[PDB]
Chain length 135, copies 2
């Protein structure tokens, strides 16, 4: 079984990536798809918002994973979902160790390119498996 890991994001590039996976792997029987989303404290203001922020992120994680899950399940793919927490980029690369292909959507608004996202200089070099980049 070929294990695909798709790092989802709320971007149009990830929407194109989802369609592309379907176009390229949708008729493949020996193939599973896993959607990964990673839920991402200093100063009084940040500390007081902690609970509201944690709630917002849990809600965002559920909605985004459901949106991508529904996209696939109505078109013949029953994906797995993995929701992690930590630094998004590091957690994606760590999860990828157990898969055969990592798929990412690349765009300016990608979680990969956030100001504080890790591995912006070496992502492909650090990836333990092949990487498919869709724009």
């Amino acid at each position: 079984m070929k294990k695909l890991l798709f790092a989802i994001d709320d971007t149009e590039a990830c929407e194109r990536a989802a369609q592309y996976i379907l176009d390229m792997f949708g008729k493949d029987a020996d193939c599973t798809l896993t959607l990964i989303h990673v839920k991402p404290l200093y100063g009084e203001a940040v500390l007081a918002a902690y609970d509201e922020i944690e709630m917002k992120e849990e809600e965002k994680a559920k909605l985004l994973t459901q949106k991508f899950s529904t996209f696939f399940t109505e078109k013949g793919i029953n994906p797995f979902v993995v929701i992690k927490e930590g630094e998004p980029v590091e957690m994606v690369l760590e999860e990828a160790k157990d898969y055969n292909l990592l798929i990412i959507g690349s765009s300016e608004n990608s979680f990969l390119n956030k100001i504080f996202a890790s591995h912006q200089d070496d992502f492909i070099q650090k990836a333990p498996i092949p990487v498919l980049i869709v724009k």
Copy 2:
């Protein structure tokens, strides 16, 4: 038909990419595979022009033959009859231009690739210039 374009080089990374293509797309009857090799433009030192002019040009054509034969054999023995394209020019420009007419570009990442540098990041210029999705094999 989904059109795969595979840029071939004389690297172990490219050997890994070829096998990965077989593993991921080998059983797919709606795939075509095209191999591309780009011969670089002529530049030599004067010392080499004097010492070996005839045989460096000959060796450069032999590289193209030997590479395309190696990968043609690899795939044909596993049931895939690939198309083969040989260009001459600036490899990066040539591969990216050819890629416009395909569905997936596959490259083995290596310091010795046609790019002469390993892929480091998704932010890499080559990745950003690619007109189609790119699959990078390490």
